[PDB]
Amino acid sequence: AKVEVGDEVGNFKFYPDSITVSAGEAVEFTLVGETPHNIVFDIPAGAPGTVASELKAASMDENDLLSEDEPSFKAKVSTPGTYTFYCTPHKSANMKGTLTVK
Numbered sequence: 001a002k003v004e005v006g007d008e009v010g011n012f013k014f015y016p017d018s019i020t021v022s023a024g025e026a027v028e029f030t031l032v033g034e035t036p037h038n039i040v041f042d043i044p045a046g047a048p049g050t051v052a053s054e055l056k057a058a059s060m061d062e063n064d065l066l067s068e069d070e071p072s073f074k075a076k077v078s079t080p081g082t083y084t085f086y087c088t089p090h091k092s093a094n095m096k097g098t099l100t101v102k
């Protein structure tokens with residue numbers, strides 16, 4: 001799957017903000033526009049350790065941004081379920097999305 005992170009106009013949005021993948025299918029998040037963004041998965045209170053580890057590995061560090069230099073990031077989630085992700089700098093600006101893994 002592919003997700004666009006941001007746009008050329010400066011909106012704090014993922015495009016699309018909902019995607020469905022098959023287990024093992026990578027999601028490639030690629031920056032669009034000049035505004036830096038990142039992507040980090042929410043880890044539910046509740047999630048088993050294996051799922052928490054998957055989600056951490058599928059997340060950028062909060063000290064990391066996509067740029068024209070490093071334009072993309074690839075996330076792989078094996079556990080079927082629905083997951084929410086967000087952008088660290090624009091988290092409060094409601095820059096978020098969902099991933100369903102079949």
Ligand SMILES: [Cu+]
Nearest residue numbers: 037038087090
């Ligand atoms: Cu952002």
